[PDB]
DNA sequence: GCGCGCCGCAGACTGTCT
DNA sequence: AGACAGTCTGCGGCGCGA
């Protein structure tokens, strides 16, 4: 229940002590810890591998955080202060100021608008083949009515432009594949779920959920847009909107797959944590090897051999060279026994612990401890880089 | 008329007698072991103009119902019987498709075989796929080789159409086709996939082989091994195995059978297509000659041992089916099967954490007090014997001096230490790390390994599942012993006290039930323990049947093959192909002539937490057409009830069995089964299986072990108590149940079936064979009576469906059920005809077993389904998130009543 | 100026015509970047993360929100982009209608919730818990790439600049020496991928309380423009943001405890992208970007012959290069295929390092054409060693 | 009621160490 | 150079589908 203390003790969550579920789900957290930032980077990298670079015709795009042009009243219950609530009752001391939302910009609440704006240029980039995609990971701002505040959510959005005849199965394919990405990296994949839903105008769609301990919460929405937004934004002509499906030029139906990576991070952090059955109440965050922020922990042994710090720096640098994040625990001072240090790396979700000791200058053997199994291996210091790369790659495979 | 809620009869006269001296026996046996105070509310009467009789008798009506039709199938069978084939064609040229092979050589090419009688067989190339190959059509005109595009290398890859043998000519007659496994060749006849009806029917050699001299269960294997336990052994020499290379030696004689020893025809790729093609074609021609000879000698034996033409015509119409699967059926082959893969990869992951959390023990010997992982290895082993400045190259040279330092004190060059320091059970179940099959964690670990019931806490008082001295199970029940805790695995060796592993259990997924209660939990861990042992319950159906549901070959028909009813409909898609799959079902698969198919003809009812239980679902009708079908409300219960009629007096009130199941209901009253055995016994859904064990004729010990399976009864407690249902229902015969004339029919010599006179298998014939086995012949009586009921429906819908202008004739009978693919415009009237045949057949059985009147409560259906798709009930769902989403559902209708006062003719 | 239309045509810079002026690109009021520009920005951020955060064992990530909560915002002090609430941006109001406040009492100048202008402030709030992270060891760092919102000078525009901040907590005695550390290290990082490193330079400067500073400049063709700045600010910001007890403020240095001086290293990745584009451009129209920084590494083509078999082997090579982590342009699945000297020098304008031509020789023996961006020669190579050549490339340019 | 998979297990060989 | 580590392989059983 109260596992969040660990995310404050080992810095995955924000600095402020009065953290609750509502502030985390709404986006009013003060920030994330460095391990949380690295877990967000791992989640974004896995999303980019599974969605963007592997799948053909998916292209990167950026949306600005602000909308510069004039626009409608917008998504606010309170209609600024010019119309909804004025100071006193209609008093004026005396224009350019207090011009309401006529010339006022808007912070973005979705990445769909930027991708739809860049659709014509990105269709010019491609050879106008109609199966197409635009992907973006970025921070979206939402007003939260705590009674007003800002909630910042890292949203990963894929806008898939699809032919209308096959949109009903393209949405089902992304329903399978996005839910498969959530089924991957999960200790309990049954907590991730999906629900079929309908729009107010009859458009179908799907919503992906995670079963948090308090209740089921939304993490991703797949929505079908039948030319409602694409035709509205470009109403001058439909000739520029026409794309080549096979031989025929037709207007593409839109599919918005928008998930939030901060709540996905919280879902994976809750999924990693699991005080029943055996008496092994070990506080370990069982993150996946490709989502764990720190892969390996490197340390100094009890024996007073000063020269081994050079060996630790060499191993640290060769593991940094080949894309393995290392906790520099060899710099640590007054280490108070190995068991709470091991519990510290278990709470930080570090896959392996490397103990460079006095007996590694001869015979090349360093101690290695796994996160999953609390057992030690006297493995040679050579080919450990290949072993960690093989472990990460073959954990990615299955 | 109003005494038992009977109805007036327009047909079936000659029952002018009142059944005198039989009514008061029914009254005195209703007042004993029966309430007799039923209000007996009259059902609403039904009046409609029925077609008249044939010979003014129901026996004379159902006779010549099977002779008005199938008379072409008698003269074509006679023409196949009388003629003599040319001995052997030696050439067997490649040619192109069909080629006429007469008495001479010279290989004259023909487009299609123009003969009314054909003996036929297909042996397909299994490695290429399901395309027909090596089909020879022997016939009194010619041997008729059909090479099926084996000579031409180039062919279509998928979406197979216009491929099979094309035996049907254009109109610008009836062409009877015989063959061993004629369903397998019938999938490759061509024009059996057409949406409109076919004038051509089929005969199966194994249908006549299991119709006379068939083998049920015990005799079938006994004569396999040969090729009371001590009897006359005449069933050995009088019958042969249903599979090939046994029928030919028994009836024809001579050689046993030719057989290819290399057996590469099922293993033939695109290579090896040219080698030994002639020897393969010679072996196939010899096999079809063997089937021709055995069919020629078994034609009069079948026509005289089954002299009622209803049996032969019912085999003829049940041999033809039509199961139209939609374009999303292959979608069912995707979204189910890959989902199984998902539940294959999650559950194994849920196993691996259960291993990994098991390695968090041993720290100060955390095992040896845990009752699941105390007897494991847990052993240790280890051995070895032979800028301001850069400041970066020193670390590089330090590690590169530690590199190549492995060369001295390398313990072995190729690493033998496979995870030393890990426990010995965890030194197993891990990939080597030297092989390319390496994958992280404790992989290559399965459910069936002996360490798996130790990893997850099975908590059946400490259930180990250790294979030595087990035989599938162990002493696990209760009471006193070992560590004086219930303690299944303390000291196995001296005593198996409190034994529950008495050998004789099914031992084969018997633990799929008793997951719900009956102990057998999955530990208090929550996250990974109980997440598994529910997943195998989800994938138990698809794990054993993914091979059978797949490789069901489908021919998506083109736009030209779609008739005018399909084209230009309000609901129609040319992208959606509605080509059918023909079922590979034998019309006689046991001693009874019931259709047997492991894929389609099973008890599947769209059960939740099952991956692929929507197999009965889909099978969407073509546009403009409707599947109209009805489950029989009470099949074997009513047959055994009217079997008791007129031998312990008539008027359907002979026994307490004969009184119930027609006036009683499932919701209220005693209709046997669940309603009275929830009072006699504790079974709720197992009460149906128990009562089927009584009625089907198993006996006391089968019921004893069956109730032993579901309960903590001791064996003396099983003998003394709770077996009294068999004692109270059946007294000493050989009370509420009568088994007298059932046993006399089981011991009757020549006439066996009461309704048709169809003989029993000669293996179960009591004159030639001293059938001292028992407990299988009563099964033959009840199941073959159900077969005769099925045949009496199938001989019906002729001149209530033939002369009347409705299309149909697609028998999709599964267990006790009848479906017909008719037009949507006359679907309600087709359901009315499907009610009319239910009236006529139940009156036929009432005509045969005693008197001529029939009660109204069984005279019509409770429901006939006019649903688009096939399902058990019309308002059901499936394990997919929504049945109406994706494929469209019209949700069906019950339609219990007769329709209206419209004309019985169309007259549109 | 020709570089602007080349980058627009080859989809480095988004927007039709509004980004043609260099003043829109020097600020952040350009409408966006192309997919090649977005991948280049991701490459530059990843290389900055490896050079600053990964390779230094003490530099740690930080998470600064794009907005301040602004509940106790000072009136008329750092009042740039205050209004927010997801739906208003009033920019700067020199003239105000003071009926009761600037706009309202609870809306403007109080509880406004200002958007961020620099990422130094987020690291300065997270300093206490990140000091707990390094077990109070003083000279450590907090670094982050983030978007900065600035006013752009009748209305005032929004400038969104992608900037990397490194905030260095140091003991004050060696603080100028750590300034000299980052002074040469950031400059060598900017000269690491430069085709001509003489354009990048650094200069010294003076402020009122920091008393020292260094500005890193790039020599654009119009003139020298700031791409990175360094400042040794005192404990004024830390004591201002935490008034009161200094016991949480001071940290453990060599044999003692002392309050840390802060070093602010702020680099504009958007001006860095513009600097590297102007450096990559120099006869024929090419973009000679660095192999570590180029958005697309290899260009795989379909060639000439049967389309199905070449398509299948190109799909296999594409999946192999994707599984090995190399970004590859799909010049296959395009049926245009005009002639020579077009689709070549278009990939050079797309800054793709190598281009692969898969022809019928690949179906014969496995040989494909490789043409380099740096040199115009073509080379015959097997399929199996293409991945090994491409993995020895880029990494060869990384280790000079 | 059998063949064919899928694990245990007990040789018997295989290979290496000193 | 035999003494002594470990890897296939050929049996028994158990379930279980054609």
Report a brief summary of the structure.
The complex is a heterotrimer, with two copies of chain A and one copy of chain B (908 residues). With 398 residues, chain A is of the alpha+beta class.
Textual characterization of the structure:
It is classed as transferase/dna. The entry lists the keywords Mitochondrial DNA Polymerase, DNA Proofreading, Backtracking, Mismatch repair, replication, Transferase-DNA complex. The assembly is pentameric. The complex is a heterotrimer, with two copies of chain A and one copy of chain B (908 residues). Helix content of chain A is 29%, strand content 25%. Chain A is α+β, with helices and mostly antiparallel strands. Chain A folds into two domains: 292 residues, Bira Bifunctional Protein, Domain 2 (BirA Bifunctional Protein, domain 2), CATH 3.30.930.10; 106 residues, Rossmann fold (3-Layer(aba) Sandwich). A seven-stranded mixed beta sheet of chain A has the order 1-4-5-11-8-7-6, with helices on both faces. In chain A, strands 13-12-14-15-16 form a five-stranded mixed beta sheet, with helices on both faces. In chain A, strands 2-3 form a two-stranded antiparallel ribbon. In chain A, helix 3 crosses helix 8. The longest helix of chain A has 20 residues. Among the domains of chain B are: 268 residues, no CATH class; 253 residues, 2-Layer Sandwich (Nucleotidyltransferase, domain 5); 79 residues, no CATH class. Chain B has 27 helices and eleven strands. Chain B is mainly α. The longest helix of chain B has 29 residues. In chain B, helix 6 packs across helix 10. A seven-stranded mixed beta sheet of chain B has the order 2-1-5-4-3-6-7. Chains in contact: A-B, A-C. The interface between A and C is large, with 71 and 68 residues. Chain B binds a DNA duplex (18 and 18 nucleotides) through helix 7 and helix 17.
